Amino acid sequence: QLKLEQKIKMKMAKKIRLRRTGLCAKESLRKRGAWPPSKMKKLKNV
Amino acid sequence: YPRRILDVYQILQSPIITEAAIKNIADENSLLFTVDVRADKKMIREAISNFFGVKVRKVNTLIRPDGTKKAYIMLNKEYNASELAKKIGIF
Amino acid sequence: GKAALCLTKRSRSRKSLARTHGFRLRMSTTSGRALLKRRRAKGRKILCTKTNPSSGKRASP
Amino acid sequence: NNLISGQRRCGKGRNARGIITARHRGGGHKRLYRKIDFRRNEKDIYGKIVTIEYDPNRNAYICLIHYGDGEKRYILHPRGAIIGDTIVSGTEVPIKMGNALPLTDMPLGTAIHNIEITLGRGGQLARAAGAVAKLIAKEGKSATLKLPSGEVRLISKNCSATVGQVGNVGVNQKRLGRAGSKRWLGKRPVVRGVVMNPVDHPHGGGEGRAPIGRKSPTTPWGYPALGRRSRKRNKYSDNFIIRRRS
RNA sequence: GACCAGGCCCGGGCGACUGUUUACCAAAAACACAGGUCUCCGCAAAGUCGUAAGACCAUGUAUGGGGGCUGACGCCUGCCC
RNA sequence: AGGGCCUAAGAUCAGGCCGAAAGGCGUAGUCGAUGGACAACAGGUGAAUAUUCCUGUACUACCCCUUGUUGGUCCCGAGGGACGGAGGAGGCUAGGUUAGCCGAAAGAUGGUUAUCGGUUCAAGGACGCAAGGUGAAGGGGUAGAGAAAAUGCCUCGAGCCAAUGUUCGAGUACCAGGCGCUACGGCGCUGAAGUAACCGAUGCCAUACUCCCAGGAAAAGCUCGAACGACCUUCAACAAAAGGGUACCUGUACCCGAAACCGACACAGGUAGGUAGGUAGAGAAUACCUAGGGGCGCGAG
RNA sequence: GUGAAACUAAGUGGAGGUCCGAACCGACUGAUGUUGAAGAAUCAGCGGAUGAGUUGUGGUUAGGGGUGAAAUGCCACUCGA
After folding, report:
1. Which end of chain D, N or C, is more open, meaning fewer C-beta atoms within 10 Å of its C-beta?
2. Cα D164 from Cα D32, distance rounded (Å)
């Protein structure tokens, strides 16, 4: 009885905010260098 | 209202003639030119396409440190740059 | 020591140096405008050092 | 919350010229600004207290009011009050702690606060922690008030005043306890006079340890501190003041 | 077992204490300090900066704000106008 | 990465005030990142560039067309962006080690294979959350100047929030080792195994949790929304759908714990941030090493 | 253990201008250096090292001035102007 009116909205909202948090996890990992995973697999030095 | 800065009909100074350019003609299917320092990508693609009647997948440009803009002009898989450039005296 | 000493200069952005001594600064002030009068009068090739372009090659973004 | 706004003036010991006129400022902690309605000019609209909270910009606490029609304001917390208590501003209204009313209709001798000096402005007198005024008399156009300083002053009778003493009476029972506590409170060190050189301060110089040698105790700028009045002379308000302080 | 990795105790002066200071001869017993006391100021506040406008004080209002001296804490602080 | 977006400190300031001149104050605004807001990764190539060129697989913003609704758009009123320090526990991963699996193996000396190598894969799409945390997250109408916030009503397979993880991306590669080059450089063919266990971060969950007081930026993008006031309006504005089609300016070299910046020097000096391997150790100290880089521009006695 | 407070044993907890000690910031002692490797360094040790802490970027204050936890110290190897 219209019991998925949450799960219509909640699903797409979750998929939005997971994208957003993914992209923000990228943005902050660019600023302090240490991004493009070629570099990260290359380096492990001390 | 088109051009950032109006410049000319002219724009394109000359094609670069060297060993890198000849190889890039074969590999990338792309021409190489020296243009106006105040030349835009949009401006170059409108010029060269409208001049030779050929398509332009993309243009990519830089300013060599003296201050003269050189542009790589890439062409579609259809149009053949080797034979095109042959009839403008590069081969 | 670990603090270096009596190097009056450092490596500082040309932005800040152009906002302290650049053309657009000198040109605003009436007192400072008469400095350019003296500089053209003496006939110095470079009027005010420490000017930058907003454009490339010497851009300080 | 649209009442808690980060709109500081910044620096805040420095004038227009950019010189430190008000001395011994800086360091501090970053703080925000709570607007507080000292006017309390939302008239005949019945209000309800909800929370008592810390204002970093004061001695006394702030009180968050929700009005019946549905809008919110910050005010000064009165002494006895608690969460979920009730208030109202207007002309009639009872003399229950934390209500607002013009000085004419008020009882003789009541502990009050937030008093205007000029009608229209807002509320200037008795704003600190424990601030308390006691209406002594009334005379024609005027009401005769005794202030927290211990001074009796004629002010206009139509002017506003909020009933009750202002809360948080115990903030004299700090010890601070350390240099660092006053440093992060906004204040900064105060260098004595007699210590400095003659070029800097009047007491300055002197070989060995210096006695305050120049007949008087002086400011930095020549004007005898420690006994010497400074209430202009023939100021506009002169007539209205009745007494001194303690 | 190498490199690495507290010497400890008893008695006195000064300053309570962490702190700051003479870049390039002085780091302290010097300054600051919490605490104390006095004196000014009722808001168009005293004070400060400005020829002025006006700015700080304060978007603060006497449990607050300016200035003098003393310098935790304990017991004190006499005579002379 | 910056600019074509946004604002702080600060700057300049229309009208306005004040001043012999020069100018000073100051609102509306406008600039001003060190901050907010925004869309890409791997492999490949090459004398000198590569998240920029190549190959694959992605994503953001616009113009088509299928459904539509009648207005849009700005101003404007709200939500939100949105913020402290300290501490601690849990779940994870990056990274490490060991085993297994696969290939190779004489290293001239008592023994000895106990030896040596490899065991790799990003962004993004689709999909679920546990003795991880909590037990209103997310809605819908209604009164009263009231569309939001606020005083009373109900309803929730009683659940939510996330980093990791399962798949495709990736029957491709990448790949240790073998089989041929001909002179001072890499390059053609081939191509095995490609897993498990334990340790494990200062990395992520977390703008989470507890505690504390000294009480912790703004503005736009974003989402609502009812007004009033203007514009743009029936070859049109806002919503959704696959497939298309389209893609501005500047920086990019090289040094950057330095013989290239700053110290007059190819000067025993100073210089913001990022990545952090093994053995021993509490440890980013130390000692010896790996990857990587060097033997300090006078030598001989 | 009390009329209840008070008080006291064990757990939990993670305060502190707390302790020891790298980076970081300093500059106490010596040795070296003195036409230096350096117009304040090298070396060996030293203090703080979660705070009144350090520091990048971008700004503010101007010489009858500024700034100064105050030495007349600092304000571009210049400071009783």
Report:
1. C
2. 27
Cβ distance B74 to B57 under 8 Å? yes
Q: Does B63 touch chain C (CB under 8 A)?
A: yes
Whether B3 is in a domain gets the answer no
User: How far from the centroid of its chain's Cα atoms is residue D74's Cα?
Assistant: 16
Experimental method: cryo-EM
Q: How many CB atoms lie within 10 A of CB D163?
A: 22
- How do beta strands B30-34 and B14-15 pair? antiparallel
Please state, in angstroms and rounded to a whole number, the distance separating the CA atoms of residues D244 and D104. 24
How many domains, chain B?
1
D161: exposed, middle or buried (Cβ count in 10 Å: 0-12, 13-18, 19+) = buried
Question: What are the boundaries of each domain within chain D?
Answer: 1-88, 89-246
Q: How far apart are CA D192 and CA D145, in angstroms?
A: 39
The resolution in Å comes to 3.6
User: Does the D1-88 domain belong in CATH 2.40.50.140?
Assistant: yes
Distance from CA of B60 to the nearest CA of C (A): 17
Q: Report residue D27 as tokens.
A: 């360091």
Biggest alpha carbon–alpha carbon distance for chain B? 39
Nucleotides of F under 7 A from a protein CB: 1-3, 8-12, 22-26, 33, 35, 37-43, 47-48, 51-54, 78-79, 82-83, 94-96, 120-127, 137-139, 144-146, 148-151, 156-157, 160-163, 204-207, 214-218, 247-253, 258, 261-263, 269-271, 273-278, 289-291
Question: Which residues does B68 contact at the CB level (< 8 Å), separation at least 6?
Answer: B13, B34, B37
Test C56 with B63 for CB contact under 8 angstroms: yes
Question: Going from the N-terminus, what domains does chain C have, and what CATH number goes with each?
Answer: 1-61 (1.10.287.3980)
DSSP category for residue D78: B
Distances (CA, A) of B27 to A29, B32, D207: 36, 13, 89
D79 touches D164 (CB < 8 A): yes
- Closest by alpha carbon to D149, among D134, D164, D167? D134
Which residue segment(s) compose the domain that B49 sits in? 11-91
Distances in Å between the alpha carbon of B59 and those of A39, B33, B90, C56, D94? 29, 11, 20, 20, 81
Distance (Å, rounded) from C-alpha D149 to C-alpha D104? 23
Structural domain includes residue B79? yes
Q: Are B47 and B35 in contact (CB under 8 A)?
A: no
